[PDB]
Design an enzyme around this catalytic site. Sequence first.
Site, short mmCIF file in Angstrom:
data_model
loop_
_atom_site.label_atom_id
_atom_site.label_comp_id
_atom_site.label_asym_id
_atom_site.label_seq_id
_atom_site.Cartn_x
_atom_site.Cartn_y
_atom_site.Cartn_z
N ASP A 88 0.83 -1.21 0.00
CA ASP A 88 0.00 0.00 0.00
C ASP A 88 0.86 1.25 0.00
OD1 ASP A 88 -2.48 1.13 -0.22
OD2 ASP A 88 -2.96 1.04 1.92
N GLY A 186 -3.00 7.25 3.70
CA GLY A 186 -2.15 7.91 2.72
C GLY A 186 -1.33 8.93 3.47
#
Lengths: 234, 52
Positions: A88, A186
């Site tokens: 990720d 993020g």
Amino acid sequence: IVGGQECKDGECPWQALLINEENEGFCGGTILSEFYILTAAHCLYQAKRFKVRVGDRNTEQEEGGEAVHEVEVVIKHNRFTKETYDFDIAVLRLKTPITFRMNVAPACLPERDWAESTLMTQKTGIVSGFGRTHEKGRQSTRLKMLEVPYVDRNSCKLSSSFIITQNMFCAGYDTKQEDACQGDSGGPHVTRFKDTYFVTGIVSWGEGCARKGKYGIYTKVTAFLKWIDRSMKT
Amino acid sequence: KLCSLDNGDCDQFCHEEQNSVVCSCARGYTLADNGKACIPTGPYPCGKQTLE
Ligand SMILES: COC(=O)[C@H](Cc1cccc(C(N)=[NH2+])c1)[C@@H](C)NC(=O)c1ccc(-c2cc[n+]([O-])cc2)cc1
Ligand SMILES: [Ca+2]
């Protein structure tokens, strides 16, 4: 962010914010350079069209330090798997360069060996973002930060209901009501070493938020330094 | 011993080479004349909270 404190002036300058066509921030990011933003691959799925906003601390008043930037290239990890959230990580190249000013500066990328042995063995790291404030609450208008303790790999692998790949590490509390949350993904996970902050993770996922017996999962950035490095030269 | 003892007295990156400590810095810094401290190359170096 659940718990934690508000990022004060110039405190979290590397925080970036992915916004959708409707101007709503949906994910976070870390300023890596004037041209590069580090974020979570799973985020590049949360919006049809998106941009990057830096220098923002309150999504309710145009202070003036802000700057919206368009993404020219988005570099997602080839091996990213949506089912497991493995790999990720993603890099965004902005069309126009970021002008470093108050509340806008990059975070340092550490060297792998030094980072894992000297940085990740520290008591804590710092996590920030505009994500939800409560597992069931609306997103935040204020940029927040949270001191999140590094969690023993074994106690984490044990605490999780799903697989903790080698591209993940844990931070957070077992019972204490403090943890990252939706909207923070993020976002940056940095570690301070002698007044200098180094990027050490990427808000990835977690089972709910601030749940008892559960932690926050972050992408192990030290495992992708040669990749990030490459992505920044393309 | 070495980088294990207080980061080898380096401001940032510590490397043990030939049983000795060698210090280094991230991009935007330059190793000081003492070979340990890291000096910013310009304004707004990485990892620094903005003071102005
Ligand atoms: C309110 O809840 C949230 O926002 C959560 C997302 C989320 C985002 C950023 C940080 C954190 C955190 N540190 N707690 C948590 C919530 C929507 N997510 C989950 O339930 C959730 C996240 C992953 C998996 C999952 C499924 C399969 N594999 O193989 C690995 C992981 C299952 C459930
Ligand atoms: Ca603002």
